[PDB]
Amino acid sequence: AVDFINYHASDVLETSGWKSMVVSHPHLVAEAYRSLASAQCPFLG
Amino acid sequence: GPVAESWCYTQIKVVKFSYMWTINNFSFCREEMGEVIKSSTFSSGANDKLKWCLRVNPKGLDEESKDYLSLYLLLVSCPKSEVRAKFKFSILNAKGEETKAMESQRAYRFVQGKDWGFKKFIRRDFLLDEANGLLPDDKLTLFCEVSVVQDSVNISGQNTMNMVKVPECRLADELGGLWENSRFTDCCLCVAGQEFQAHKAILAARSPVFSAMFEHEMEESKKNRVEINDVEPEVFKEMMCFIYTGKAPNLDKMADDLLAAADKYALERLKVMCEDALCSNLSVENAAEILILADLHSADQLKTQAVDFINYHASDVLETSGWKSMVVSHPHLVAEAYRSLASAQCPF
Amino acid sequence: GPVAESWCYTQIKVVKFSYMWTINNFSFCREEMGEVIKSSTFSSGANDKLKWCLRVNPKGLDEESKDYLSLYLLLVSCPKSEVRAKFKFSILNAKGEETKAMESQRAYRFVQGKDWGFKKFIRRDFLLDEANGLLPDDKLTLFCEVSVVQDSVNISGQNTMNMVKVPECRLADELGGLWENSRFTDCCLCVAGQEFQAHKAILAARSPVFSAMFEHEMEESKKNRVEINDVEPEVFKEMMCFIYTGKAPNLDKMADDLLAAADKYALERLKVMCEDALCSNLSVENAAEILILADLHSADQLKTQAVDFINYHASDVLETSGWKSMVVSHPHLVAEAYRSLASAQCPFL
């Protein structure tokens, strides 16, 4: 699910569930950021 | 060294763009001779209406250039009629150094949709050979620089002549004389018990917060004495020396609390200067703290640069304990970092 | 690797299929040359709309091949117009490592119904030899790898541009606005009936003359109703604007009286600026009154420049009536002009 959200982040962030997990489960989005940044990149700049 | 009655100065204006073109899986060139791979339009801040682009022909423009990759520069957008400029191309090797860097001797004239480049740029075999290192990880790293000349301007700074002088601007220094000598102030403030004296006019003129404090509910009853019990005097005096003199010497040493004081008292220029001091001290071990401060004290440019720095150096900021603290205390900051990183890593 | 101010990233997207193809009891090909044994259609996850299949002739497709195995790849459905790809075939041996791998160097195009392949893929006797073991238990295993190139895409990001721009020092602008808005005023000046209003600290700092009648315990009496009778109100307002702002906008048109007010009020910046304004007004007829005013208001640079101008242009100055007035009323001015003319710009004769 984390990888699916990372792949479809441009549309996922608009949903209400994402906006609710932002409030309710902060370390979940922290894991999302970690697996988007640490598990990818460098991407030029 | 002679002494000249007159001197003149002719300066020709030169603007330098820099550009870095990296092409992935170039050996999958996807086509035969006659293929054109263009780049994105690029420009700098000035004047930002001069748009340039690259056009590479991997096989070659013509039958003479079959074993020659050709590299051309094309000016797509230009407001004026003519632009005279001189270009230099290079390729970064696996270490990253420039190789086969050839320049143009001339400043060619460019117009809307005119291209000038090297057809005979580099041998196809010399590029394709792995031992040269010129295709590291099948990635073609061009790097181009263009210098555009403009019409020159003459200063005509004829010296001597009128010998009357202007006595600079002592306003700031003699305003600091109202602070150091203290020169018969009008109100007494108080910094956690310590005594400071200040006027009212300068504080009101340069501080809307101080003016709103001073005129409403204060000029009738407590006009003389006010107590600022939220900032330390070691930075409050620096704040009151920025207020008087229009400049702060000891700013970079104590910019951590001076930003908070400046944002508390709405001092926009002092706030931006504190943002500059903190932005110039960005580091991976404290970037979470910097972002915490820049969101707490409503800074915008400092917060934006901290966000960008964390995006750049997210490899090791994660290990630092400060990021863990910002995760546990300010989730929305991490969410905004994810949001910015989403646009950063958008196509993947 | 130096730092670049801007960059681009050309990304030609490539996907890779991986496919296996096992035929049981291959020696029972059951038929002669020309025959074709298609494989089940296969794809990958994305885009999954491109459908590929393998077509093998166990005997020769052509009269030139005959004792040859021939392998083709065929695209049966394409959502796009054409798709470019590179393919590599291999026959798996008894252990399972890839043997006899032949690939196409070019990125061939493909439409629906067009096939590309190797007719001269592998010698039939080489395949049917048991010692090399390319046919274990009468099983033929083909491993085919297909790489499709897509469109290029460019990301166009700019590197480190700005450090944080600082707003300009607005002390002069805000102090001029403080003079205009007259906020928390502490004093009321008088000029020819006009009652201006201004502060105390800034005035007593900029002008020692105001400090003289401000510091001598004359606050309750004189700060409230301080009287000035010399300067006309417009020139006085311009002088107050110079005090508060440090700027004199319309200095050029009032160079005389503004110099007079500056000399009265010991402003040793507006005074010299008025001197500068008067210096670039030195015609052959008004230099006499320029010298008179400079002498009266004790200006140095202006007086010296006017004396030099008179020594230069005396051929008309003595004819003009102003010099005669100077001769009549100001003997010391003519004496000082003679003293400058004495040991300068004439001692050759």
XYZ file of C-alpha atoms in Angstrom:
742
model
C 0.000 0.000 0.000
C 2.893 2.372 0.729
C 4.402 1.682 -2.691
C 0.997 2.088 -4.364
C 0.516 5.450 -2.646
C 4.047 6.473 -3.668
C 3.252 5.567 -7.273
C -0.146 7.320 -7.261
C 0.636 10.200 -4.878
C -0.504 12.926 -7.306
C -4.097 11.688 -7.037
C -4.040 10.081 -3.574
C -3.332 13.302 -1.649
C -6.630 14.798 -2.858
C -8.734 12.134 -1.139
C -10.324 12.600 2.266
C -8.742 9.427 3.639
C -5.262 10.812 3.047
C -6.299 14.101 4.637
C -7.563 12.157 7.658
C -4.497 9.939 8.034
C -2.462 13.159 7.991
C -4.178 14.070 11.256
C -4.718 10.649 12.812
C -1.543 8.700 11.973
C 1.473 10.999 11.556
C 4.208 8.366 11.587
C 2.305 6.621 8.785
C 2.952 9.573 6.499
C 6.474 9.611 7.934
C 6.903 6.040 6.677
C 5.411 7.181 3.361
C 8.015 9.949 3.099
C 10.798 7.554 4.098
C 9.849 4.973 1.488
C 9.404 7.646 -1.164
C 12.715 9.440 -0.542
C 15.107 6.927 1.045
C 13.941 4.066 -1.207
C 14.407 6.159 -4.367
C 16.609 9.073 -5.591
C 18.968 10.814 -6.682
C 16.721 12.367 -9.344
C 19.061 15.115 -10.619
C 17.705 17.894 -8.392
C 50.534 56.010 -12.245
C 49.594 59.356 -13.766
C 46.902 61.683 -12.480
C 44.247 62.152 -15.147
C 41.976 65.167 -15.467
C 39.311 62.924 -17.004
C 38.645 59.183 -17.014
C 36.100 57.202 -19.017
C 34.843 53.670 -18.585
C 33.375 51.456 -21.294
C 31.808 48.234 -20.029
C 30.202 45.660 -22.324
C 27.504 43.673 -20.532
C 27.855 39.879 -20.555
C 25.269 37.421 -19.211
C 26.210 33.776 -18.612
C 23.730 30.913 -18.693
C 24.796 27.436 -17.618
C 23.133 24.209 -18.678
C 23.566 20.513 -17.899
C 22.019 17.928 -20.232
C 21.971 14.285 -19.127
C 20.452 11.661 -21.442
C 19.644 8.199 -20.128
C 20.145 4.939 -22.088
C 21.708 6.754 -25.004
C 22.837 3.524 -26.692
C 19.113 2.955 -27.259
C 19.302 5.917 -29.631
C 15.899 4.784 -30.987
C 16.530 6.013 -34.549
C 18.878 6.217 -37.526
C 20.567 9.284 -39.103
C 18.515 12.458 -39.197
C 17.172 12.052 -35.673
C 16.903 15.241 -33.615
C 16.718 15.135 -29.827
C 15.808 18.527 -28.388
C 16.245 19.756 -24.814
C 14.006 21.772 -22.568
C 14.045 25.546 -22.917
C 16.303 27.107 -20.303
C 17.176 30.588 -19.047
C 18.413 32.499 -16.007
C 16.722 35.307 -14.105
C 17.941 38.050 -16.454
C 16.218 38.881 -18.549
C 14.254 35.605 -18.467
C 12.745 36.213 -21.929
C 15.817 34.747 -23.674
C 15.012 31.058 -24.092
C 17.673 28.703 -25.419
C 17.617 25.005 -26.253
C 19.892 22.193 -27.358
C 19.479 19.931 -30.383
C 21.660 16.836 -30.694
C 21.911 14.589 -33.740
C 23.273 11.272 -32.445
C 24.183 9.700 -35.769
C 24.821 12.829 -37.797
C 23.349 15.726 -39.720
C 24.693 14.520 -43.064
C 26.663 11.778 -44.784
C 29.953 13.453 -43.899
C 28.954 13.332 -40.216
C 27.910 9.666 -40.017
C 30.613 8.767 -37.496
C 30.094 12.146 -35.815
C 27.562 13.006 -33.162
C 26.553 16.614 -33.801
C 25.585 19.165 -31.150
C 23.740 22.396 -31.932
C 22.448 25.364 -29.947
C 19.164 26.957 -31.007
C 17.680 30.187 -29.615
C 13.949 29.626 -29.467
C 12.597 32.817 -27.873
C 14.107 36.288 -28.112
C 12.316 39.633 -27.718
C 14.875 41.685 -29.631
C 16.024 41.483 -33.232
C 19.581 40.196 -32.817
C 21.477 38.543 -30.001
C 25.237 38.190 -30.269
C 26.656 35.429 -28.134
C 29.533 32.993 -27.826
C 29.015 29.376 -26.784
C 31.169 26.608 -25.321
C 30.142 22.940 -25.159
C 31.629 20.139 -23.089
C 30.910 16.591 -21.926
C 31.406 15.391 -18.354
C 33.195 12.050 -18.026
C 32.623 9.424 -15.323
C 34.646 11.395 -12.783
C 32.787 14.456 -14.034
C 35.514 16.492 -15.713
C 35.026 18.329 -18.987
C 36.221 16.470 -22.084
C 36.281 17.481 -25.767
C 35.385 20.978 -24.591
C 35.421 23.123 -27.715
C 34.402 26.765 -27.796
C 33.313 29.069 -30.572
C 35.809 31.788 -31.381
C 33.061 34.095 -32.647
C 30.015 35.692 -31.097
C 27.456 34.431 -33.581
C 24.286 36.354 -34.322
C 21.077 34.593 -33.280
C 17.491 35.338 -34.297
C 14.117 33.701 -33.628
C 14.690 30.082 -34.609
C 18.356 30.146 -35.637
C 20.786 27.351 -34.769
C 24.587 27.403 -34.611
C 26.567 24.407 -33.498
C 29.321 21.912 -34.135
C 28.372 19.274 -36.676
C 31.868 17.783 -36.332
C 31.723 17.508 -32.555
C 32.821 14.044 -31.441
C 33.653 10.708 -33.027
C 30.916 8.102 -32.722
C 33.418 5.388 -31.830
C 35.253 7.629 -29.356
C 31.965 8.335 -27.593
C 30.761 4.729 -27.718
C 34.012 3.295 -26.351
C 33.651 2.441 -22.671
C 37.366 2.835 -21.910
C 37.148 6.574 -22.582
C 34.515 6.781 -19.844
C 32.511 9.259 -21.918
C 29.271 7.279 -21.547
C 29.180 6.419 -17.829
C 26.188 4.176 -17.043
C 25.004 4.753 -20.652
C 24.298 8.360 -19.621
C 25.276 11.224 -21.932
C 26.208 14.280 -19.834
C 26.517 17.371 -21.974
C 27.221 20.717 -20.314
C 26.917 23.989 -22.248
C 27.650 27.627 -21.429
C 26.492 30.651 -23.422
C 27.748 34.226 -22.986
C 25.493 36.865 -24.548
C 26.921 40.343 -25.138
C 24.705 43.419 -25.145
C 25.164 46.968 -26.334
C 27.833 48.503 -24.129
C 27.417 51.549 -21.925
C 29.905 54.340 -21.226
C 30.027 55.657 -17.677
C 31.537 59.055 -18.663
C 32.729 59.590 -15.111
C 34.746 62.732 -15.870
C 36.561 63.410 -12.577
C 37.735 66.688 -10.985
C 35.498 69.370 -12.614
C 32.956 70.357 -9.923
C 34.832 69.898 -6.650
C 31.876 70.275 -4.289
C 31.307 67.276 -2.027
C 28.335 65.635 -0.335
C 28.597 64.668 3.392
C 27.181 61.104 2.975
C 24.400 60.197 5.440
C 25.077 60.486 9.181
C 21.382 59.923 9.979
C 21.866 56.351 11.180
C 24.960 57.034 13.298
C 23.465 60.111 14.912
C 20.309 58.094 15.522
C 22.436 55.543 17.327
C 23.624 58.535 19.301
C 20.050 58.710 20.624
C 20.566 55.166 21.916
C 24.147 55.019 23.190
C 24.172 58.493 24.767
C 20.430 57.881 25.470
C 19.856 61.618 24.916
C 16.690 62.430 26.933
C 14.180 59.755 25.942
C 10.406 59.731 26.512
C 9.504 56.250 27.788
C 11.124 53.588 29.947
C 10.775 49.989 28.839
C 11.754 47.018 30.994
C 13.491 43.800 29.966
C 12.829 41.261 32.745
C 13.702 43.799 35.433
C 16.509 45.570 33.577
C 16.045 49.238 32.688
C 16.130 50.638 29.160
C 15.029 54.038 27.896
C 13.635 54.777 24.454
C 11.646 57.385 22.611
C 8.257 56.767 21.079
C 8.423 58.264 17.578
C 11.129 56.022 16.130
C 9.633 52.887 17.685
C 6.225 53.784 16.251
C 7.623 54.694 12.823
C 9.606 51.484 12.405
C 7.352 49.169 14.466
C 3.570 48.908 13.896
C 3.371 46.624 16.929
C 5.061 49.244 19.108
C 2.809 51.970 17.688
C -0.303 49.888 18.383
C 0.999 49.239 21.899
C 1.856 52.899 22.471
C -1.267 54.683 21.234
C -4.104 52.357 22.306
C -4.837 52.037 26.068
C -1.304 53.292 26.914
C -1.075 57.048 26.277
C -3.677 57.764 28.976
C -2.559 55.628 31.941
C 0.806 53.856 31.536
C 2.484 56.120 28.970
C 5.849 56.166 30.747
C 6.582 52.537 31.654
C 6.177 49.344 29.629
C 7.483 45.846 30.398
C 8.705 43.576 27.604
C 9.069 40.320 29.552
C 9.494 37.825 26.700
C 12.975 38.447 25.234
C 16.470 38.449 26.691
C 18.260 41.829 26.935
C 21.374 40.548 25.121
C 19.284 40.350 21.940
C 16.750 43.065 22.834
C 19.539 45.652 22.822
C 20.620 44.340 19.412
C 17.004 44.696 18.283
C 16.857 48.267 19.618
C 20.136 48.972 17.844
C 18.686 47.745 14.598
C 15.630 49.907 15.239
C 17.711 53.033 15.805
C 20.653 52.590 13.435
C 18.965 50.590 10.676
C 21.589 47.830 10.990
C 22.617 45.037 13.375
C 26.305 44.045 13.774
C 25.990 41.129 16.202
C 23.276 39.358 14.220
C 24.759 36.062 13.019
C 25.919 35.158 16.537
C 22.412 35.425 18.035
C 20.078 35.119 15.048
C 18.220 32.232 16.717
C 16.282 34.455 19.131
C 16.551 37.642 17.083
C 14.242 36.109 14.462
C 11.665 35.339 17.158
C 11.956 38.869 18.556
C 11.707 40.411 15.080
C 8.640 38.358 14.186
C 7.086 39.210 17.560
C 7.578 42.910 16.828
C 6.743 42.645 13.083
C 10.149 44.022 12.039
C 10.044 42.778 8.457
C 13.572 43.716 7.385
C 15.131 42.393 10.595
C 13.081 39.213 10.169
C 14.388 38.764 6.611
C 17.957 39.424 7.792
C 17.559 36.812 10.530
C 16.195 34.437 7.884
C 19.319 35.159 5.850
C 21.582 34.429 8.820
C 19.807 31.137 9.519
C 19.628 30.156 5.828
C 23.369 30.704 5.515
C 23.830 28.294 8.455
C 21.782 25.383 7.088
C 23.124 21.970 8.033
C 21.782 18.437 8.117
C 22.065 18.101 11.901
C 19.853 21.116 12.599
C 17.600 21.512 9.533
C 14.603 20.101 11.410
C 15.184 22.672 14.163
C 15.491 25.399 11.522
C 12.238 24.321 9.873
C 10.597 24.184 13.315
C 11.676 27.766 13.999
C 10.706 28.963 10.511
C 7.202 27.550 10.835
C 6.715 28.682 14.444
C 7.804 32.260 13.724
C 5.840 32.380 10.435
C 8.910 32.718 8.214
C 8.278 31.871 4.573
C 11.484 32.148 2.539
C 13.514 30.504 5.319
C 10.912 27.739 5.612
C 10.958 27.229 1.833
C 14.751 26.971 1.740
C 14.755 24.600 4.726
C 12.181 22.444 2.915
C 14.338 22.409 -0.218
C 17.478 21.593 1.799
C 15.694 18.696 3.502
C 14.529 17.473 0.078
C 18.132 17.587 -1.135
C 19.693 15.943 1.932
C 16.899 13.587 3.037
C 19.426 10.729 2.946
C 20.953 11.529 6.340
C 18.540 13.980 8.025
C 16.402 10.922 8.785
C 19.136 9.535 11.040
C 19.338 12.694 13.157
C 17.319 12.767 16.376
C 15.907 16.189 15.505
C 13.906 14.745 12.620
C 12.463 12.168 15.017
C 11.454 14.965 17.383
C 9.830 16.894 14.529
C 7.999 13.714 13.534
C 6.630 13.206 17.042
C 5.734 16.864 17.638
C 4.943 18.510 14.264
C 3.474 15.945 11.855
C 2.190 18.621 9.480
C 5.756 19.734 8.792
C 6.594 16.200 7.688
C 3.403 16.152 5.621
C 4.426 19.370 3.886
C 7.868 17.842 3.308
C 6.150 14.859 1.700
C 3.999 17.211 -0.380
C 7.004 19.157 -1.668
C 8.902 15.919 -2.255
C 5.903 14.632 -4.221
C 6.263 17.441 -6.746
C 10.036 16.896 -6.647
C 9.695 13.150 -7.400
C 6.549 13.638 -9.500
C 7.301 11.686 -12.747
C 8.299 8.488 -10.914
C 32.099 17.992 -11.996
C 31.361 21.683 -11.447
C 28.045 23.026 -10.200
C 25.498 23.764 -12.912
C 22.921 26.505 -12.651
C 20.296 24.502 -14.594
C 19.827 20.908 -15.716
C 17.636 18.575 -17.742
C 17.099 14.817 -17.583
C 16.221 13.044 -20.818
C 14.507 9.817 -19.807
C 13.646 7.401 -22.598
C 11.353 4.990 -20.753
C 12.125 1.306 -21.262
C 10.086 -1.684 -20.086
C 11.291 -5.281 -20.123
C 9.292 -8.437 -20.751
C 10.682 -11.828 -19.792
C 9.227 -14.953 -21.347
C 9.717 -18.711 -21.373
C 8.376 -21.162 -23.933
C 8.535 -24.926 -23.410
C 7.482 -27.475 -26.034
C 7.054 -31.102 -25.066
C 7.966 -34.030 -27.359
C 9.593 -31.772 -29.929
C 10.828 -34.619 -32.161
C 7.143 -35.165 -32.892
C 6.974 -31.956 -34.864
C 4.476 -34.111 -36.833
C 4.825 -32.071 -40.028
C 7.230 -30.857 -42.696
C 8.770 -27.495 -43.560
C 6.837 -24.251 -43.388
C 4.862 -25.215 -40.309
C 4.424 -22.791 -37.454
C 3.716 -23.393 -33.770
C 2.407 -20.220 -32.121
C 2.768 -19.550 -28.386
C 0.144 -18.270 -25.972
C -0.059 -14.482 -25.912
C 1.876 -12.759 -23.142
C 2.494 -9.246 -21.800
C 3.658 -7.391 -18.695
C 1.769 -5.347 -16.114
C 2.153 -2.003 -17.902
C 0.720 -1.196 -20.235
C -0.662 -4.751 -20.722
C -2.249 -3.585 -24.012
C 0.745 -4.775 -26.054
C 0.307 -8.469 -26.827
C 3.292 -10.513 -27.983
C 3.683 -14.094 -29.137
C 6.433 -16.421 -30.295
C 6.273 -18.204 -33.650
C 8.659 -21.093 -34.271
C 9.192 -23.182 -37.378
C 10.748 -26.507 -36.303
C 11.846 -27.030 -39.894
C 13.166 -24.436 -42.309
C 10.912 -21.547 -43.242
C 12.890 -21.033 -46.457
C 14.688 -23.151 -49.014
C 17.927 -21.549 -47.823
C 17.387 -22.590 -44.195
C 15.915 -26.139 -44.370
C 18.025 -27.823 -41.664
C 17.549 -24.771 -39.474
C 15.395 -23.683 -36.571
C 13.689 -20.333 -37.180
C 12.245 -18.126 -34.442
C 10.159 -14.981 -34.809
C 8.447 -12.564 -32.468
C 5.071 -11.200 -33.527
C 3.018 -8.348 -32.066
C -0.678 -9.178 -32.359
C -2.325 -6.059 -30.898
C -1.000 -2.511 -30.592
C -2.901 0.415 -29.041
C -0.352 2.831 -30.502
C 0.692 3.344 -34.121
C 4.057 1.570 -33.943
C 6.344 0.434 -31.127
C 10.140 0.185 -31.231
C 11.863 -2.655 -29.394
C 14.974 -4.822 -29.168
C 14.681 -8.567 -28.570
C 17.059 -11.326 -27.458
C 16.390 -15.058 -27.798
C 18.108 -17.965 -26.095
C 17.715 -21.741 -25.997
C 17.908 -23.142 -22.486
C 20.024 -26.287 -22.102
C 19.619 -29.275 -19.761
C 21.046 -27.542 -16.693
C 19.174 -24.375 -17.566
C 21.796 -21.794 -18.425
C 21.198 -19.666 -21.503
C 22.944 -21.038 -24.586
C 23.068 -19.944 -28.240
C 21.726 -16.503 -27.381
C 21.194 -14.320 -30.451
C 19.815 -10.793 -30.193
C 18.813 -8.091 -32.644
C 21.075 -5.054 -32.344
C 18.533 -2.677 -33.871
C 15.423 -1.244 -32.251
C 13.011 -2.637 -34.794
C 9.571 -1.209 -35.342
C 6.442 -3.293 -34.808
C 2.832 -2.926 -35.891
C 0.008 -5.424 -35.600
C 0.722 -8.460 -37.733
C 4.381 -7.674 -38.463
C 6.942 -10.189 -37.264
C 10.703 -9.981 -36.877
C 13.111 -12.758 -36.131
C 16.049 -14.986 -36.916
C 15.431 -17.525 -39.640
C 19.034 -18.690 -39.244
C 18.643 -19.126 -35.512
C 20.359 -22.457 -34.784
C 21.550 -25.416 -36.855
C 19.078 -28.295 -36.789
C 21.760 -30.957 -36.348
C 23.245 -28.853 -33.547
C 19.845 -28.838 -31.836
C 19.267 -32.555 -32.448
C 22.675 -33.529 -31.113
C 22.173 -35.019 -27.663
C 25.739 -34.464 -26.428
C 25.362 -30.687 -26.186
C 21.996 -31.410 -24.570
C 19.933 -28.595 -26.054
C 16.968 -31.012 -26.248
C 16.674 -32.630 -22.800
C 13.865 -35.217 -22.526
C 12.590 -34.064 -25.942
C 11.839 -30.652 -24.442
C 12.675 -27.373 -26.152
C 12.858 -24.367 -23.835
C 13.049 -20.873 -25.313
C 13.800 -17.783 -23.240
C 12.890 -14.565 -25.051
C 13.540 -11.094 -23.644
C 11.858 -8.043 -25.158
C 12.776 -4.431 -24.393
C 10.336 -1.780 -25.599
C 11.514 1.814 -25.835
C 8.905 4.498 -25.205
C 8.873 8.260 -25.577
C 11.573 10.459 -24.105
C 10.588 12.851 -21.299
C 12.499 15.800 -19.829
C 12.142 17.150 -16.321
C 13.683 20.673 -16.635
C 14.665 21.626 -13.095
C 16.916 24.551 -12.062
C 19.649 24.150 -9.411
C 21.334 26.278 -6.818
C 18.345 30.398 -7.810
C 18.382 32.942 -4.994
C 19.698 33.631 -1.613
C 17.090 35.564 0.306
C 16.756 39.116 -1.001
C 16.848 41.775 1.710
C 14.519 44.799 1.583
C 16.417 48.058 1.321
C 17.171 50.223 4.343
C 13.918 52.154 4.749
C 15.045 54.390 7.619
C 15.026 57.569 5.524
C 11.689 56.726 3.884
C 10.028 55.906 7.208
C 11.454 59.010 8.894
C 10.175 61.172 6.035
C 6.815 59.487 6.460
C 7.055 60.236 10.183
C 7.557 63.913 9.362
C 4.574 63.819 6.991
C 2.186 61.858 9.229
C 3.398 63.733 12.373
C 2.723 60.821 14.707
C 3.362 61.342 18.448
C 4.578 64.869 17.810
C 6.305 66.614 20.709
C 6.784 70.223 19.509
C 5.088 72.968 17.494
C 7.251 75.173 15.268
C 6.177 78.561 13.906
C 7.113 79.997 10.494
C 5.371 83.168 9.236
C 1.989 82.358 10.753
C 2.208 78.667 9.891
C 2.306 76.313 12.871
C 4.246 73.269 11.810
C 4.571 70.320 14.154
C 7.689 68.207 14.685
C 9.541 66.089 17.241
C 12.448 66.910 19.569
C 15.077 64.151 19.471
C 15.598 64.090 15.695
C 15.728 67.887 15.397
C 18.093 68.339 18.341
C 20.319 65.611 16.919
C 20.441 66.894 13.339
C 20.799 70.598 14.207
C 23.064 71.762 17.062
C 21.254 75.119 16.876
C 17.975 73.455 17.838
C 19.875 71.588 20.552
C 21.039 74.988 21.837
C 17.481 76.172 22.583
C 16.339 72.633 23.427
C 18.923 71.537 26.023
C 18.996 74.670 28.199
C 15.926 73.866 30.383
C 13.639 75.733 27.964
C 11.385 72.735 27.384
C 8.102 73.693 29.064
C 8.411 77.241 27.701
C 9.845 76.890 24.174
C 9.213 73.337 22.904
C 5.435 73.856 22.962
C 5.455 77.225 21.167
C 8.884 77.590 19.558
C 8.967 80.630 17.275
C 10.949 81.049 14.060
C 10.641 84.277 12.101
C 13.364 84.185 9.441
C 12.731 81.308 7.042
C 9.773 81.409 4.686
C 7.465 78.391 5.163
C 8.196 76.527 1.904
C 11.978 76.756 2.335
C 11.589 75.873 6.024
C 9.501 72.827 5.087
C 12.161 71.769 2.578
C 14.783 72.190 5.312
C 12.690 70.097 7.716
C 12.403 67.475 4.964
C 16.197 67.489 4.636
C 16.485 67.051 8.407
C 14.028 64.175 8.677
C 14.737 62.394 5.388
C 18.311 63.332 4.550
C 17.058 64.282 1.078
C 16.521 67.609 -0.698
C 14.319 66.975 -3.775
C 13.701 70.489 -5.182
C 16.979 72.025 -3.978
C 17.815 73.458 -7.423
C 15.120 76.135 -7.672
C 15.641 77.691 -4.206
C 19.422 77.602 -3.827
C 19.667 81.057 -2.218
C 17.255 81.027 0.726
C 17.811 77.345 1.450
C 21.516 78.145 1.787
C 20.569 81.019 4.093
C 18.454 78.745 6.295
C 21.164 76.075 6.308
C 23.799 78.604 7.374
C 21.470 79.862 10.098
C 20.810 76.335 11.371
C 24.414 74.983 11.095
C 23.386 72.113 8.808
C 26.817 71.430 7.316
C 25.339 69.058 4.738
C 22.442 71.061 3.319
C 24.759 74.079 3.374
C 27.338 72.397 1.157
C 24.597 70.914 -1.040
C 23.201 74.416 -1.547
C 26.751 75.485 -2.400
C 26.822 72.680 -4.975
C 23.511 73.912 -6.399
C 24.824 77.483 -6.630
C 28.089 76.336 -8.226
C 26.355 75.094 -11.379
C 24.597 78.431 -11.858
C 27.637 80.705 -12.312
C 26.807 83.046 -15.166
C 28.882 86.141 -15.881
C 26.322 88.550 -14.388
C 25.202 86.982 -11.078
C 28.621 85.911 -9.756
C 28.813 89.167 -7.790
C 25.731 88.395 -5.703
C 26.851 84.756 -5.504
C 30.095 85.985 -3.930
C 28.185 88.391 -1.671
C 25.926 85.590 -0.428
C 28.834 83.165 0.005
C 30.790 85.751 1.993
C 27.761 86.630 4.112
C 26.939 83.001 4.927
C 30.615 82.026 5.438
C 30.822 79.333 2.745
C 34.284 78.213 1.684
C 34.025 76.092 -1.472
C 31.342 78.276 -3.043
C 33.272 81.480 -2.311
C 36.522 80.064 -3.687
C 34.820 78.792 -6.852
C 33.038 82.119 -7.361
C 36.323 83.989 -6.825
C 37.935 81.750 -9.445
C 35.018 82.361 -11.817
C 35.294 86.133 -11.354
C 39.061 86.012 -11.940
C 38.315 84.010 -15.095
C 35.452 86.131 -16.456
C 36.259 89.644 -15.189
C 36.209 90.916 -18.805
C 32.419 91.262 -18.488
C 31.939 91.334 -14.698
C 33.369 94.836 -14.280
C 30.937 95.960 -16.991
C 27.958 94.414 -15.202
C 26.388 96.559 -12.485
C 26.635 93.933 -9.734
C 30.415 94.265 -9.564
C 29.999 98.026 -9.145
C 27.632 97.375 -6.240
C 30.253 95.043 -4.763
C 32.891 97.759 -5.187
C 30.665 100.319 -3.464
C 29.384 98.290 -0.531
C 31.777 95.346 -0.018
C 35.385 96.569 -0.255
C 36.718 93.436 1.440
C 35.242 91.176 -1.251
C 37.082 93.047 -4.006
C 40.213 93.000 -1.832
C 40.026 89.220 -1.386
C 39.395 88.725 -5.112
C 42.505 90.819 -5.751
C 44.430 88.723 -3.216
C 43.492 85.520 -5.047
C 44.243 87.160 -8.411
C 47.612 88.345 -7.048
C 49.486 85.089 -6.513
C 47.676 83.078 -9.234
C 46.554 82.994 -12.889
C 48.391 86.147 -14.164
C 51.981 86.022 -12.720
C 53.945 85.576 -15.931
C 54.448 89.228 -16.867
